[PDB]
Design an enzyme around this catalytic site. Structure first.
Site, mmCIF file in Angstrom:
data_model
loop_
_atom_site.group_PDB
_atom_site.id
_atom_site.type_symbol
_atom_site.label_atom_id
_atom_site.label_comp_id
_atom_site.label_asym_id
_atom_site.label_seq_id
_atom_site.Cartn_x
_atom_site.Cartn_y
_atom_site.Cartn_z
ATOM 1 C CE1 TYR A 81 -3.641 2.526 0.330
ATOM 2 C CE2 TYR A 81 -3.074 2.783 2.641
ATOM 3 C CZ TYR A 81 -3.804 3.168 1.530
ATOM 4 O OH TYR A 81 -4.709 4.176 1.690
ATOM 5 N NE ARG A 86 -1.506 5.374 0.666
ATOM 6 C CZ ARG A 86 -0.924 5.303 1.850
ATOM 7 N NH1 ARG A 86 0.197 4.601 1.985
ATOM 8 N NH2 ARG A 86 -1.470 5.962 2.878
ATOM 9 C CG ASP A 87 -5.110 6.622 -0.537
ATOM 10 O OD1 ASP A 87 -5.696 5.505 -0.447
ATOM 11 O OD2 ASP A 87 -4.048 6.914 0.087
ATOM 12 C CB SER A 93 -3.499 10.635 0.175
ATOM 13 O OG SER A 93 -2.665 9.428 0.175
ATOM 14 C CG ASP A 133 -8.514 4.496 -2.024
ATOM 15 O OD1 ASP A 133 -9.497 4.560 -2.740
ATOM 16 O OD2 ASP A 133 -8.018 5.570 -1.482
ATOM 17 C CG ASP A 312 -10.739 3.643 9.139
ATOM 18 O OD1 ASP A 312 -9.930 2.726 8.754
ATOM 19 O OD2 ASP A 312 -11.878 3.414 9.488
#
Length: 358
Positions: A81, A86-87, A93, A133, A312
């Site tokens: 990940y 990312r994201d 992010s 994601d 999260d």
């Protein structure tokens, strides 16, 4: 063929140390303390969300090698990940690499590092979820500029991951979102083409076993009545999503099998007001314990991918990388930064667990 059959799943010391050092000293009730200690023995995935976590992968596999030379038959469970940008559709992010600043080369080194660790431990079966994601955004979120720009990098980086980690001791499951993302009927055909083309463009790697669903999400596996926030999707649980999506992938030459994250889906319906509310959701419990005995040939295993009790995202709007989803009224608050221990959320999951720990 099922990589979860014939092995136990290692419960890693990183999660166990969060429970034992951070959680249990805050719990007074003896029954809840015992429940917490039991939860720390349920094997969940270890997330490699920075390059600086790759030593943790190596230490974990060294602990598994010791356990297995002493009679164990454990497999390791890791999440890859760290894509650049990312994201891409998220409002915040935590990814450390940027496409515009050497991110594709940094991803190459991250994958190269993981490949050498998995080769170093070629005696250990290594079960990977690849890039939560990520590709799902290329099915629905191309109207978001960061995602439109990230297409080429995500596709090349995922191809590098699945080809370089195509080793005899590995099984990989590409993240494929959840029923409320790709399970809507209008998203199924475009998703199947995308994910089958990733598989075929990687020369159909033997280690690419299939897809992971519900990672860090809360959907039921199977529920008799659709939760109201799922309407009008007919694919209102992971079983209906997978049953609709698997044969479409197979039609395009990727005979994918699935794993489903059941770590936060034991209480149904959840407290979600809308299905796209993903952060620290209220009203959830630990769900079905990890097993290969799913009763379903499409499904290799129920697994705990997102570790319960790790936040999260922060709910502090003045903190760095705040995502407003974490301040919604169905998100438990106050919450610490993503990945940090969130005691009240761990207690929530333990108390609402199904099967129960108490």
């Amino acid at each position: 063929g099922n990589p979860f059959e014939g092995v136990q799943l290692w419960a890693n010391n990183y999660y166990r140390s969060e429970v034992h050092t951070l959680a249990i000293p805050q719990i007074t009730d003896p029954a809840l303390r015992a429940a917490a200690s039991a939860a720390a023995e349920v094997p969940s995935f270890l997330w490699l969300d920075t390059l600086d976590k790759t030593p943790l992968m190596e230490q974990t596999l060294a602990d598994i090698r010791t356990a297995n030379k002493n009679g164990g038959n454990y497999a390791g469970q890791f999440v890859v990940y760290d894509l650049p940008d990312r994201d891409c559709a998220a409002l915040a992010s935590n990814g450390e690499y940027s496409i515009a600043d050497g991110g594709v080369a940094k991803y190459k080194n991250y994958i190269d590092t993981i490949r050498q660790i998995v080769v170093e431990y070629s005696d250990i079966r290594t079960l990977l979820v690849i890039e939560p994601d990520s590709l799902a955004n290329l099915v629905t979120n191309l109207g978001t500029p960061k995602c439109a720009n990230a297409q080429s990098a995500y596709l090349e980086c995922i191809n590098y991951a699945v080809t370089q980690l195509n080793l005899p001791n590995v099984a990989m499951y590409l993240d494929a979102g959840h029923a409320g993302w790709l399970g809507w009927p209008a998203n199924l055909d475009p998703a199947a083409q995308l994910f089958a083309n990733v598989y075929k463009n990687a020369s159909s790697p033997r280690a690419l076993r299939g897809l992971a669903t519900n990672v860090a999400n809360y959907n039921a596996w199977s529920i008799a009545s659709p939760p109201p926030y799922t309407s009008p999707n007919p694919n209102y649980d992971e079983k209906h999503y997978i049953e609709a999506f698997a044969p479409l992938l197979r039609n395009q030459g990727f005979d994918a099998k699935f794993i489903v994250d059941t770590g936060r889906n034991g209480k149904q319906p959840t407290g979600q007001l809308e299905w796209g509310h993903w952060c620290n959701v209220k009203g959830t419990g630990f769900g079905v314990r990890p097993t290969a005995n799913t009763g379903h040939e499409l499904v290799d295993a129920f697994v705990w991918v997102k570790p319960g009790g790790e936040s999260d995202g922060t709910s502090d709007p003045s903190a760095p990388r705040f995502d407003p989803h974490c301040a919604l009224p169905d998100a438990l608050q106050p919450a610490p930064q993503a990945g940090a221990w969130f005691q009240a959320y761990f207690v929530q999951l333990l108390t609402n667990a199904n099967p129960s720990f108490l």
